[PDB]
Structures are given as C-alpha cells and as structure tokens.
Subunit: 100 residues, 2 copies
C-alpha cells in the first residue's frame, strides 16, 4: 500500500501543477483579449473619433475573444471541481491519504 | 475495485490531455518564434541589403525566442518518459489495465 500511495501522490502533484498552468493561461488569455480590445478601441478612435466608437462598441471585439476567454475561465473553475471530487473518491476507495 | 479502476482511467486521460495541450502550446511557441524572426530578416534584407544581413544574422532574433522555445519543447521527451514509467508502475501495483492510446 505504501508504494501505490506514493505513486498516487506524485500523480496528484503532477495534475495540480498542470491545473495551475491551465488556470494561469486562462487568466492570461482574458487579459490578452481585453488588452486586444483596448488596443482596437484605441485604433478605432484614431480612425473614427470617440463618439462613433461609443455607438459601435461591439466592433472593438468582433470575434468576441473576451467572451471566449471568460468561457475559458469558467472551464478552469469546472476543472477544479471535477479534480477535487475525483481524487476524493480515489482517497476513499484506496484508503490512502493522497491529497493533503 | 471496478470503481477505482474507472477513476484511475479517467485520471490518466486527464493527464494525457494536459500533456498534449502543453506540448502543443510549446510547439506553437516555436512556430511563432521562427515566424517572427523570418519576418524581421526579410525586412532587414530590404532595408540594409543582403550583404549586411549576411554579416549580422543574429540580429533577426535578438532575444533568442527561437532557442528559448526549442529548449522548452525539448523537455517534452523527459515529461513523456516520467509519465509512462509512473503509470506503468501504478498498473502493475493495482493489477488494472489503465493506459490508453
């Protein structure tokens, strides 16, 4: 039991590190999307003036990268919930302390 | 133990998917870096002439994004090895067939 427990603890540590990366990348993806829209709003300001840009706000993110990024963050939140439940069930079935 | 096997199978799928995304992301980083340098080089050729560029080739990637990207991608090999060995051991210890293509 001792050996399998250590293999499982290593597997869990690996998954947590992958998850942290997934979350960090989703956060960066949202930042990048917002920066990109900020940049386009600035360029559209130079091309058409601020009033015009105010009455065509949807054009600063034509491909809706911001909303897509928000869905990405939602999935990260979902990933966390799935992982927590899965390892908890694994701990219960093995009788091993794997996570904490 | 039928339930545990399913939980472990799922865990393995999740890990393999993470691994592939990370590898794909590093591959994308390399592609992007090469692209960036190839673009700068073309621009420099027309601005300064081919003779000049042929004597200042390192200026196409001043921050070495290409070498940096290559270095990170190279780790994929060790990451694969570590994963295969760990799960092989888990399979042996549990007596379960867990791994996937």
């Amino acid at each position: 039991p001792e050996a399998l427990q250590k293999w499982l603890q290593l597997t869990h540590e690996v998954e947590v590190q992958y998850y942290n990366i997934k979350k960090q990348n989703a956060e960066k993806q949202l930042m990048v999307a917002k920066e990109g829209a900020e940049k386009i709003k600035k360029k559209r300001n130079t091309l058409f003036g601020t009033f015009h840009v105010a009455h065509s706000s949807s054009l600063d993110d034509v491909d809706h990268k911001i909303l897509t990024a928000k869905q990405a963050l939602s999935e990260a939140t979902a990933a966390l919930r799935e992982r927590l439940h899965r390892w908890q069930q694994i701990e219960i079935l093995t009788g091993f302390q794997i996570v904490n």
